[PDB]
Design a protein around this ligand. Structure first.
Ligand SMILES: C[C@@H](N)[C@H]1CC[C@H](C(=O)Nc2ccncc2)CC1
Ligand SMILES: C[C@@H](N)[C@H]1CC[C@H](C(=O)Nc2ccncc2)CC1
Lengths: 383, 383
């Protein structure tokens, strides 16, 4: 019937008008209307006094910050915050992200939580940190995700001399995770060690997605903003900043190269004091790139890095991931391309409790109807 | 769980935030926002282009004027319209009311469809025409209700000499229907033959409710507008027009009196050429009321009429319906107060098809965010 067809969409968690959508819908409309200012308008007042009561009972029944306990903040910065939390009822342990709504739109034109949400909600991939539920309130987005007790790659690199045996591993894992995202029609565009976390067993997942983007039917994207961390940006993306940016996934392979280099050499290949110095060097890569003579690297590890750090037109992986997978550097004995996430991780976390956070550092009205909650509608996500 | 408690309300057809509410919610928000004018606002545009597509598929799946065929208009006037319709899929026959949204609020401050809706939706009473579903579109409310093939009492009276045997019957039926409404905490306030229809078997239901009102915990209402048909208004309601109106249900019994009189005498007891003449007479009832000498009425039929047409302070039924039920006028042989709607109606309709309509007559952008659909949210009603 027409009637079932409806109930389909309202339930489908991938539908833009499932229950949460609507409840977000109604809920934001309250917020964006409830001011002595526009309550002057006839309609607006009546309406608000009607739903008034019920909306409070609802606000109480839904998911709430309160449903959780903060074990401690394990990541703060220019974004919002990550806290180790304990679900009060389930007694269980999660990582929760807090995003400033205020920031989120008004400043960030290019931090699409939308993309992020869907990915963590529905990637259903061993390569992608997973989102168990999302909710908002007036100020905040909240993302409840698997606690990754291993810490990030920055932290890891920060603590060890990474031999190549190790590096092979992390690189491979990154490549797999990236190809995941790619083959989901997305370009990641922000491949940095800070976005790579390790689970309980010391295997990798990608944990941020705020900058991903659906590709052309040709595999390309059209873009005019540069995005990412200065140190890791590709030339093409750097250039896209000047309007008329057109590039594919191979920009993610660029960053991989950097990553490898940083992992093997313990510095990033285009370090400078200015960001422009950095940029300068990135554009000048053909001359700016090279290896300290005391760095102990294999020739293969050098080819691969070099095969990555070049212009899209020649860069490795423009022919897809298989030629990457096939580079000599990867020949090894502990794993192959199919079993790797089953093999022994090179650094195994030893976690004494389910809240052991040793791998992280300690931290330190309108006039018009404006309608600010609109973009947050359909964010709340359940199960 | 908290989680089930939710799904309760979203399903409960009596909840102000069941699915239709929300879908009305989302839907009206589109309409009240989709203008080149405010699409200038950042939020408003983005939002609208998002839901854009999905809302069209929905608009198609829901209940639509189109789902029905118009057999013919059987009532038009200062309200909107009633049409005999055939549900296309079920092949079945209903009466459908059309209300101008434009009118509905902007002019009418006192035509609470809300009250009407709930009554016909949920009275679930043999005395109350029944509502099978309600839907809106941009212009209109639509009410799908049982076709009452008998026509109204105005029509009936218009066609026969009503003997008292008959009158006893219709009055009794009215009294029962009224007491129904009352004992649902409501005062009807617009008792007129035009609001009394007859079903297939020639029994009565009340078909309009736009003027009903929840009573005090004391059984009273506070009111400052007069409502009803000039000919039938009670003194107290007429006076309420002057601010400080305070009265109970016994104002509905006033109108009953009129009704009886009109039925027995074939004219209304306070007829004049002006409305004020009428009003004059109504206030002057103590002297203005009396019976033409050629009118053939029983003494009992006169007491009762007179017992009704007096000031609330003394009027019959201020002590509840039982003293009415007990008036001698009602002594009869065909029915008692409990079986009446099972007994033989005095005028039995003879309807040759399921669309025989012989008992009816032939008929002949904003600037600000204004928010006009708000008051219509939660009107759509299903099953
Ligand atoms: C650098 C930013 N793009 C961003 C990287 C991911 C990080 C995170 O989600 N952390 C996390 C998740 C789960 N468990 C532990 C940490 C927060 C900040
Ligand atoms: C006079 C107004 N208060 C109003 C009276 C009720 C009427 C109606 O619903 N008519 C109707 C319903 C079902 N079947 C036949 C007619 C429409 C106009």
């Amino acid at each position: 019937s027409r009637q079932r067809k409806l109930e389909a969409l309202i339930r489908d968690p991938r539908s833009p008008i499932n229950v949460e959508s609507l409840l977000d819908g109604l809920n934001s409309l309250v917020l964006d209307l409830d001011f002595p200012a526009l309550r002057k308008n006839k309609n607006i007042d009546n309406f608000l006094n009607r739903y008034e009561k019920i909306v409070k009972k609802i606000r109480g029944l839904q998911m709430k910050a309160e449903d959780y306990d903060v074990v401690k903040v394990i990541g703060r910065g220019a974004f919002g915050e990550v806290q180790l939390v304990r679900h009060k009822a389930s007694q269980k342990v999660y990582a929760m992200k807090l995003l400033s709504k205020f920031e989120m739109i008004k400043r960030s034109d290019s931090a699409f939580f939308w993309e992020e949400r869907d990915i963590m909600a529905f990637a259903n991939s061993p390569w992608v940190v997973q989102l168990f539920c999302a909710f908002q309130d007036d100020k905040y987005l909240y993302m409840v995700m698997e606690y990754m007790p291993g810490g990030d790659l920055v932290n890891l690199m920060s603590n060890y001399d990474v031999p190549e045996k190790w590096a092979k591993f992390y690189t491979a894992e990154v490549v797999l995770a990236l190809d995941a995202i790619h083959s989901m029609g997305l370009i990641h565009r922000d491949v940095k060690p800070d976005n790579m976390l390790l689970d309980k067993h010391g295997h990798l997942k990608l944990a941020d997605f705020g900058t991903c983007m659906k590709m052309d039917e040709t595999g390309m994207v059209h873009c005019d903003t540069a995005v990412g961390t200065p140190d890791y940006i590709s030339p093409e993306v750097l250039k896209s900043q000047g309007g008329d940016g057109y590039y594919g996934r191979e920009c993610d392979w660029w960053s991989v190269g950097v990553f490898l280099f940083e992992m093997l050499v313990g510095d990033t290949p285009f370090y400078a004091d200015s960001l422009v110095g950095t940029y300068s060097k990135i554009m000048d890569h053909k001359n700016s790139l090279c290896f300290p003579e005391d760095a102990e690297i294999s020739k293969h590890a050098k080819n691969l890095i070099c095969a990555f750090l070049t212009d899209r037109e020649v860069r490795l992986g423009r022919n897809g991931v298989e030629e990457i997978k096939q580079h000599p550097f990867f020949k090894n004995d502990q794993w192959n391309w199919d079993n790797i996430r089953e093999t022994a991780a090179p650094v195994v976390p030893e976690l004494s409790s389910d809240i052991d956070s040793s791998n992280f550092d300690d931290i330190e009205i309108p006039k018009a109807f404006v309608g600010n909650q609109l973009p947050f509608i359909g964010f709340t996500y359940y199960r």
